[PDB]
Design an enzyme around this catalytic site. Structure first.
Site, PDB file in Angstrom:
ATOM      1  N   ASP A 162       0.855  -1.205   0.000  1.00 37.48           N
ATOM      2  CA  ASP A 162       0.000   0.000   0.000  1.00 37.48           C
ATOM      3  C   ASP A 162       0.886   1.249   0.000  1.00 37.48           C
ATOM      4  O   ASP A 162       0.460   2.245  -0.521  1.00 37.48           O
ATOM      5  CB  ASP A 162      -0.995  -0.032   1.153  1.00 37.48           C
ATOM      6  CG  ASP A 162      -1.552   1.330   1.472  1.00 37.48           C
ATOM      7  OD1 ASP A 162      -0.902   2.046   2.206  1.00 37.48           O
ATOM      8  OD2 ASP A 162      -2.626   1.650   0.989  1.00 37.48           O
TER       9      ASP A 162
ATOM     10  N   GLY B 258       2.594   6.393  -3.363  1.00 40.15           N
ATOM     11  CA  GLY B 258       3.278   7.677  -3.430  1.00 40.15           C
ATOM     12  C   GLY B 258       4.351   7.704  -4.502  1.00 40.15           C
ATOM     13  O   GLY B 258       4.448   8.659  -5.279  1.00 40.15           O
TER      14      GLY B 258
ATOM     15  N   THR C   2      -2.891  13.349  -6.413  1.00 46.35           N
ATOM     16  CA  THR C   2      -4.068  14.175  -6.191  1.00 46.35           C
ATOM     17  C   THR C   2      -4.365  14.232  -4.700  1.00 46.35           C
ATOM     18  O   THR C   2      -3.945  13.364  -3.930  1.00 46.35           O
ATOM     19  CB  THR C   2      -5.304  13.627  -6.917  1.00 46.35           C
ATOM     20  OG1 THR C   2      -5.670  12.366  -6.343  1.00 46.35           O
ATOM     21  CG2 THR C   2      -5.012  13.430  -8.400  1.00 46.35           C
TER      22      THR C   2
ATOM     23  N   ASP D  89      -5.261   3.703   5.624  1.00 45.11           N
ATOM     24  CA  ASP D  89      -4.419   3.411   6.784  1.00 45.11           C
ATOM     25  C   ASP D  89      -5.266   3.175   8.029  1.00 45.11           C
ATOM     26  O   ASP D  89      -5.026   2.230   8.793  1.00 45.11           O
ATOM     27  CB  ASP D  89      -3.437   4.557   7.038  1.00 45.11           C
ATOM     28  CG  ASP D  89      -2.288   4.575   6.061  1.00 45.11           C
ATOM     29  OD1 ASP D  89      -2.126   3.590   5.310  1.00 45.11           O
ATOM     30  OD2 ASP D  89      -1.543   5.578   6.048  1.00 45.11           O
TER      31      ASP D  89
HETATM   32 NA    NA Z   1      -5.868  10.186  -7.294  1.00 44.40          NA
HETATM   33 NA    NA Z   2      -1.558   3.637  -0.200  1.00 46.03          NA
HETATM   34 NA    NA Z   3      -2.719   3.509   2.966  1.00 42.74          NA
END
Ligand code: NA
Ligand code: NA
Ligand code: NA
Ligand SMILES: CCCCCCCCCCCCCC(=O)OC[C@H](COP(=O)([O-])O)OC(=O)CCCCCCCCCCCCC
Ligand SMILES: CCCCCCCC/C=C/CCCCCCCC(=O)OC[C@H](O)CO
Ligand SMILES: CCCCCCCC/C=C\CCCCCCCC(=O)OC[C@H](O)CO
Ligand SMILES: CCCCCCCC/C=C\CCCCCCCC(=O)OC[C@H](O)CO
Ligand SMILES: CCCCCCCC/C=C\CCCCCCCC(=O)OC[C@H](O)CO
Ligand SMILES: CCCCCCCC/C=C\CCCCCCCC(=O)OC[C@H](O)CO
Ligand SMILES: CCCCCCCC/C=C\CCCCCCCC(=O)OC[C@H](O)CO
Ligand SMILES: CCCCCCCCCCCCCCCCCC
Ligand SMILES: CCCCCCCCCCCCCCCCCC
Ligand SMILES: CCCCCCCCCCCCCCCCCC
Ligand SMILES: CCCCCCCCCCCCCCCCCC
Ligand SMILES: CCCCCCCCCCCCCCCCCC
Ligand SMILES: CCCCCCCCCCCCCCCCCC
Ligand code: NA
Ligand code: NA
Ligand code: NA
Ligand code: NA
Lengths: 337, 335
Positions: free
Chosen positions: A196, A200, A210, A221
């Protein structure tokens, strides 16, 4: 054994923060185990590794690990090349042709190094980046970037990866923890939390993320943390039938939610809410290591789960206070509305 | 610069609705652009305008505009004087005679403002008039806030007290199966925690820190309600399916609020949903109370309320996310 051939440049004679860029890059490469040779025309002494640096560059990484055959890059600019000794068998005097031939004959990967190509018009930025470097995010980038590239190329998007990782983490937590498989559950949850985290880097490769993506990543999270703690609680309450440990687990769940909420809400009001002894990475490592050690194959230590849960509980309560203090000391916090 | 010379009085030390009259008039005149100086014997610093207040007064107007030479009045009582800087040339040490001389030398108009001259025997009337100025809700919430302020409490203290009392009620009464008294206590003290808003309105107007604290305490209260309910359901009722429903309610109640906070931190919207916090509390509290109602409790009310809530919460979780997705600038790329 390791030779670093650095091409002489005009700007290496400039000084930066008391030391010259020449001595700076020399000591940086020497820290990496290289014997440094400055050159204008290349003469290849016999070695096992060659680090050839052609453009003028300031290296902003303290620990530099170079292996295999690589093209060192920095913000799209090709800084240098990391070849084996066999490049001496291909180097025929003409550096560009030898480099192209070697690249055609071998398999090389790119190596994103935290550095900046030095020019006459960017030395102030070089100073700022050197200060930023002096305060591993660079190693984090160097590991995540190829994975992000691969995931983007097969058609995944950053938000899709966020949802995939969060769904796999909640599935692992809610399936494996309730049936008592604490060690494989910890492994699966950790793997997919790291997964996950790739959104980034993927968004960075798309030249931008975004705001919705950031909100989604953070809310996911929270969902993943809730699921980890809920599956552990199910096992502790109905598998172990341990009421004191359930008290600790409920404390951990609620306090982790509120700890993240404090930062979000403080930033929504224009204040700070960060800080604390236990943030999300430390919180996840403590609970997962405790669960994994408690169910470790052959030599499990069952008390690791309670010890991790109780320490985290106290460590979370404290953090909850600490973040509040942050909000309390933020400029404009006690300003009257 | 313009100076406001206020004569010091003992009564300015009295508190009305949490703040002292000294601090109240000080902030009021600062809003009018004056540098405020309390005095007993007057020493005229150099300024362009002088606002001289001799009697102890509570000013009940938010916007005070002073430009010329005037005598501030209120229901016939002379509140203060608005003179020019040239008054410094006429001030000879004795304030009353200098004021009379300056009034004799100039033409001034009476500026009827909304204020009240303070005495020891009208402070209750002054507090009532200040409350009228600052603003059932009126018959119950405002007097309770006034009373809480009078004994030295502040809004943040009432937030912490109400949240602590509701968490205590939830964690003591629910786990041992006293669902109806727990629901009663929790509802009462959630309202108590809600009194913080009225107290802030009566005082300065509240702080960003206070708003953040009130919301985080809301999260703590919700967590404790669901945790005590979960304890009873798991070890008292031994109902595992209802435990999954309760855990869903708990986690979703935290995440639903987190989404809105985080979206607003990013400059986006995140509100909405079918079941908000008041509706969530009403549903779970009514189900627990009916399940443990005195004389003829209906046991199925607790699971029905929870499952509805669970289904109602998950959906809400999507809605707010959709809201974030449809907020202006949400999907804009950040270079
Ligand atoms: Na997005
Ligand atoms: Na993520
Ligand atoms: Na996340
Ligand atoms: C809403 C998600 C629910 C789906 C859960 C999927 C679990 C599948 C079963 C996997 C095998 C587990 C075997 C086991 O020993 O426990 C079974 C248990 C339900 O059985 P019973 O005891 O209720 O009859 O299984 C459980 O009780 C699972 C415990 C998890 C319940 C907590 C749910 C919290 C949700 C977190 C946030 C949700 C995102 C919005
Ligand atoms: C859609 C949902 C349909 C659900 C349909 C009903 C399912 C069975 C109900 C079980 C509740 C437990 C019944 C007995 C426990 C009462 C719970 C309670 O509140 O108990 C308080 C008291 O202290 C205890 O002695
Ligand atoms: C500070 C407050 C509490 C710190 C921890 C106090 C609680 C110590 C827990 C000891 C214990 O009994 O462990 C819980 C569980 O039952 C094991 O399986
Ligand atoms: C995608 C791969 C991610 C995680 C896989 C982790 C694999 C976990 C392998 C565990 C093997 C196992 O069965 O271990 C049981 C353990 O001994 C009982 O305590
Ligand atoms: C029921 C217990 C069986 C435990 C099965 C072993 C796997 C559960 C891991 C664990 O945490 O065991 C804790 C132990 O029961 C106390 O501390
Ligand atoms: C801040 C939010 C996190 C706080 C979370 C704390 C949750 C635990 C608190 C109280 C439990 C008290 C237990 C009271 C006694 C248990 C009653 C009971 O269920 O007994 C069943 C009996 O053994 C067979 O029917
Ligand atoms: C979406 C599924 C929603 C399912 C909601 C209906 C299930 C209610 C239920 O199963 O209640 C059992 C009760 O808690 C004890 O017997
Ligand atoms: C199970 C692997 C899925 C990889 C994602 C591919 C996306 C595009 C599918 C066509
Ligand atoms: C159960 C569902 C599992 C789905 C597997 C994940 C594959 C997703 C690939 C495409 C998603 C959107 C990318 C753009
Ligand atoms: C068991 C579910 C746990 C994880 C829930 C994730 C919720 C995701 C909400 C939808 C977000 C839309 C993202 C659109 C881009 C994907 C392609
Ligand atoms: C330190 C290693 C301890 C082993 C624990 C195995 C469970 C996996 C937890 C992931 C957190 C690093
Ligand atoms: C806090 C530490 C408590 C650990 C107790 C270990 C024995 C119970 C399994
Ligand atoms: C028992 C819960 C009390 C919550 C207090 C919140 C404020 C922290 C100081
Ligand atoms: Na027990
Ligand atoms: Na409050
Ligand atoms: Na406040
Ligand atoms: Na509150």
């Amino acid at each position: 054994m390791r030779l670093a051939y650095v091409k002489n440049h005009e700007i290496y004679g400039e000084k930066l923060l008391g030391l010259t860029l020449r001595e700076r890059i020399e000591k940086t490469l020497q820290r990496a185990g290289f014997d440094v040779r400055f050159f204008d025309e290349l003469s290849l002494e016999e070695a096992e590794d060659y680090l050839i640096i052609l453009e003028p560059v300031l290296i902003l990484e303290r620990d530099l690990l170079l292996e295999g055959r690589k093209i060192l890059v920095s913000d799209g600019f090709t800084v240098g090349y990391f070849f084996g000794g066999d490049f001496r068998t291909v180097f025929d005097g003409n550096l560009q042709s030898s480099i192209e031939k070697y690249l055609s004959l071998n398999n090389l990967e790119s190596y994103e190094i935290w550095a900046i190509k030095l020019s006459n018009d960017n030395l102030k930025t070089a100073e700022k980046l050197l200060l930023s470097s002096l305060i591993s995010r660079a190693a984090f980038a160097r590991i995540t970037l190829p994975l992000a590239r691969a995931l983007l190329r097969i058609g995944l998007t950053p938000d899709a990866v966020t949802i995939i990782g969060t769904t796999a983490s909640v599935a692992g937590a809610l399936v494996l923890f309730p049936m008592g498989k604490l060690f494989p559950g910890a492994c699966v949850v950790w793997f997919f939390v790291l997964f996950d985290m790739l959104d980034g880097a993927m968004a960075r490769l798309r030249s931008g993320g975004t705001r919705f993506g950031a909100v989604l990543d953070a809310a996911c999270d929270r969902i993943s943390d809730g699921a980890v703690f809920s599956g552990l609680l199910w096992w502790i309450a109905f598998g172990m039938r341990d009421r004191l440990l359930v008290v600790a687990t409920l404390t951990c769940l609620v306090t982790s939610q509120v700890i993240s909420y404090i930062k979000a809400r403080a930033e929504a009001s224009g204040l700070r809410g960060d800080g604390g002894i236990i943030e999300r990475p430390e919180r996840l490592i403590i609970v997962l290591v405790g669960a994994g050690v408690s169910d470790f194959p052959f030599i499990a230590w069952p008390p690791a789960l309670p010890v991790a849960m109780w320490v985290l509980a106290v460590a979370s309560v404290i953090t909850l206070g600490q973040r509040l203090h942050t909000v309390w000391t933020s400029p404009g916090a006690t300003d009257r509305i």
